[PDB]
Amino acid sequence: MRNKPGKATGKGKPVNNKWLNNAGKDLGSPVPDRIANKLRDKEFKSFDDFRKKFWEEVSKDPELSKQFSRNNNDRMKVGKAPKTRTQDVSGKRTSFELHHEKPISQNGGVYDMDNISVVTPKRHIDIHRGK
Amino acid sequence: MRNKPGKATGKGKPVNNKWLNNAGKDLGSPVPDRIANKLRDKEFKSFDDFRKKFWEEVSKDPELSKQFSRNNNDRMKVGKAPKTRTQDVSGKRTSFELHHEKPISQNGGVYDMDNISVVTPKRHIDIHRGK
Numbered sequence: 479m480r481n482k483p484g485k486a487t488g489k490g491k492p493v494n495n496k497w498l499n500n501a502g503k504d505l506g507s508p509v510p511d512r513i514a515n516k517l518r519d520k521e522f523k524s525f526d527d528f529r530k531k532f533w534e535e536v537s538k539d540p541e542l543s544k545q546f547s548r549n550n551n552d553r554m555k556v557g558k559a560p561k562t563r564t565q566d567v568s569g570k571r572t573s574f575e576l577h578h579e580k581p582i583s584q585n586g587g588v589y590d591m592d593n594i595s596v597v598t599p600k601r602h603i604d605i606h607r608g609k
Numbered sequence: 610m611r612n613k614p615g616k617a618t619g620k621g622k623p624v625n626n627k628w629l630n631n632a633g634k635d636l637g638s639p640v641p642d643r644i645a646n647k648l649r650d651k652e653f654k655s656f657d658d659f660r661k662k663f664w665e666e667v668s669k670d671p672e673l674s675k676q677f678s679r680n681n682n683d684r685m686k687v688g689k690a691p692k693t694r695t696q697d698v699s700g701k702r703t704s705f706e707l708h709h710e711k712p713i714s715q716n717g718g719v720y721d722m723d724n725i726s727v728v729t730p731k732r733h734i735d736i737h738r739g740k
């Protein structure tokens with residue numbers, strides 16, 4: 479399912495000036511309701527496609543982009559996720575990741591933004607108990 | 610690291626004639642005490658090496674091997690994991706898997722047989738919340 483096309487849905491949530499502040503704990507940071515407004519009802523080829531588009535919208539949002547360094551904004555401008563602090567990386571996984579709260583393998587929505595959150599590699603791995 | 614050498618420790622647990630009975634639920638089936646008796650204190654190059662020798666030991670145990678079909682014994686004889694019933698597979702993961710209760714990423718013993726169990730792919734994916 480993850481690699482099959484779908485339409486984005488979901489409301490997301492309003493975020494403040496420290497959006498990814500809690501990306502290293504619990505379920506991490508929600509999809510901003512501003513980003514969801516831009517992606518909602520849009521068709522994607524695969525989750526990876528959504529992923530790419532998700533970060534591009536982040537670089538286009540005046541309030542969201544300002545919370546990142548130039549280097550991370552440049553990355554997001556081309557669909558690449560922002561790099562985390564060294565403390566939060568794990569091997570080749572060095573940038574913020576998107577997690578599905580309810581696993582796609584368990585009928586979880588692939589493009590349901592209310593089922594998607596932003597987490598650090600380190601936290602994502604702990605969420606999946608080591609993977 | 611699961612890719613670095615180490616010595617197997619742990620006592621394992623007694624089993625009956627239905628060893629992999631609960632491989633599809635909870636933490637699955639434990640490492641047979643009989644298998645741990647043979648592997649304890651031995652050195653392995655990597656967890657993969659342990660995995661192969663673990664299945665080899667199973668094929669060598671009369672009580673355990675007799676619980677599998679000829680085709681599955683053939684696989685373990687050469688260090689390969691036995692195939693599961695179709696309902697328990699997931700994509701290319703079609704054979705029983707070893708799961709570390711406490712993850713290596715969390716200082717869990719890589720070769721601690723009391724931290725290792727046998728689970729179907731479907732169940733293992735569920736334990737890792739989606740992967």
Ligand SMILES: [Zn+2]
Nearest residue numbers: 576577578602
């Ligand atoms: Zn996840």
Ligand SMILES: [Zn+2]
Nearest residue numbers: 707708709733
């Ligand atoms: Zn596992």
